[PDB]
Amino acid sequence: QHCPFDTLLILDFETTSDAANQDYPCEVIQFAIVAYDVPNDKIREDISFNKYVKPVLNRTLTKNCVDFTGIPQRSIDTADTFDVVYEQFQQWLITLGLEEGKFAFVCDSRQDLWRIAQYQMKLSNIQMPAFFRQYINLYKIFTNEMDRMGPKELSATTNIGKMNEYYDLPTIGRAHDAMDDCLNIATILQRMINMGAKVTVNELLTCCASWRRQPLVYNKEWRSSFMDAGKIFERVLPLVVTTIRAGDFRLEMYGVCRYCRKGMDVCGTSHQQTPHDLYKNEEDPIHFAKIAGYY
């Protein structure tokens, strides 16, 4: 209706982690997708992709990772590595008969594609695909919808939690894993357009930004702060999140980098703004950058 895509794929990654440490080489350990039929307004739970992934840098899930993701060790020990699962994911898109640029991924934040996908792609030496360099940040739309329908003071602490509390949606909790997030985001997505929300690609991944031209003011305790760690991630990772305002997105933007205006098969090969300033102190090295081979 108010969406230029006939199909929306609610995407969700879960990764390895150690809550107390942000200097961590997060590897994908679960890959979950559920399809949403936009014209017919139907969450297609029968149309889904849901695979575990075996990590290779940290092969034993920490206890806090298991508690957070709900993923047992046995499930990843018997899983394929990301390169195999990603290949199965690409075939899945073909099997569904999806065309390039006529569908878009939906996430509850930038984290899934800007950070998790981008970093995992580096580990696996896979080129960042064009359909991961444009997507729908649902929480960003939720922000706009909130000013429009009047704000509330929400008690929830997470993006999905806040959105469910705002629309008074019961928290979906069956599998207690990635697929549950997918289902919650999908239901939120559905309720949002039914409340009259306008859902479209609102974030793009580009190769360059002017705000990265000056060195980051280094915070020594960044490893204990998800917020400050984000600033580090922004400089290390080659592609940056670029907001695109409502009404400005065209389908023909797929798959051309908004900045350099070149195909995403050429753009994204090399880091255009390597943060050398962060890579010169060997008494305080960035572990996740070092092990991924950024320096």
CB of 240 to Zn ion, least distance (A): 10
Phi-psi region of 281 (alpha: psi -120 to 50; beta: other; left: phi over 0): beta
Q: Are 122 and 292 a contacting pair, CB within 8 Å?
A: yes
3-state class (DSSP) for residue 96 = helix
Taking contact as CB under 5 A, which single stretch among the options 135-143, 172-180, 202-210, 216-224 is the one that binds Zn ion?
Answer: 202-210
Is the separation of the CB atoms in 273 and 208 below 8 Å?
Answer: yes
User: Cβ closer to Mg ion: 116 or 197?
Assistant: 116
Report the C-alpha gap between 83 and 146 in whole angstroms.
Answer: 39
Q: Find which of Zn ion, Mg ion, a second copy, none residue 260 binds, CB within 5 to 8 Å per kind.
A: Zn ion
Helix, strand, or coil (residue 28): strand
Closest approach, Cβ 18 to a second copy, in A, equals 5
Residue 62 binds a second copy (CB under 8 A): yes
- Radius of gyration, CA atoms only, the chain: 19
**Do the beta carbons of residue 37 and residue 135 sit within 8 Å?**
no
**Parallel, antiparallel or unpaired: strands 103-107 and 134-137:** parallel
**Residue owning tokens 């957070």:** 68
- Which of a second copy, Zn ion, Mg ion, none has residue 181 at its interface (CB below 5 to 8 Å by kind)? Mg ion
Say if residue 267 carries a ligand binding annotation.
yes
Give the integer Cα–Cα distance in Å for 160 and 70: 17
Does 149 bind a second copy (CB under 8 A)? Our answer is: no
Asked if 82 is part of the footprint of a second copy (rule: CB under 8 A), the reply reads no
Binding mask 168-207 for Mg ion (x = CB under 5 A): -------------x--------------------------
Q: Least distance (Å) from a second copy to the CB of residue 291? A: 7
Residue ranges of the annotated binding site for Zn(2+) are 207, 257, 260, 267
The residue ranges that bind a second copy (CB under 8 A) are: 18, 20-21, 23-25, 57-60, 62-64, 73-74, 77, 282-285, 287, 290-291
